[PDB]
Amino acid sequence: KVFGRCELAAAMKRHGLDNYRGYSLGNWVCAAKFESNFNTQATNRNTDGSTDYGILQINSRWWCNDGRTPGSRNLCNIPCSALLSSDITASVNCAKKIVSDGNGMNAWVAWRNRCKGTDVQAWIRGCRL
Template sequence: MKILSLPALLFSLVSVSEAKKFQRCEVTTTMRKAGLDLYYGYSLENWICMAYYGSKFNSGAVSGSNRHGSQNYGIFQISSRWWCSDGKGKTANGCRIPCSKLMDDDLQDDILCAKRIVRDRKRRMNA
């Protein structure tokens, strides 16, 4: 009986992150705490607007293929061509992150990548 209960115990200890459709207030609070308000001159409203119109606050959002065969991932719709690696094609992987990490309910890595993107002189929020 102890052998059967061990796998159940181990399974219950594993934390599984899944995609999530966030509420506006939840996203706003998370972004504010992460220091996005006025980060590189972009207001919190800019970040909220981008996340809403990009993904409808859905961390599991994935776009169709872009003209280069890349896709956009997560709440900020971050491109696999430049910023994350989806293992499907050529990427610069500027955020040094697998795209799958942008599709879970933990927004911290998404926010770190978004901060990296707006620090890029050529792209900023236009990316």
């Protein structure tokens, strides 16, 4: 599913991601835009043989099982395919674990390079949340 911006913002808010660990909703929407273009089915292979999955491009090295990242962990306790669903619940729940974990939203490279330090409220402007 390719979410619209305000659609995604509403779903993230409903699932408690807004202000989670102090990161306002616009941070999460901006991250999703630049990680996946709002597309739940996005996948991208990393140099190390892991893959990033879903609207927040969550990695199989640590967070989900894809059966093809030998030696990896599955800290979200999910198949990586769960991160591709039209329902973002699994992505949100796993993102909550990631962002609690040490570097906060710097875990998401596109957030660090394209969202951090910017007017992120722009990403929810105009929405009825």
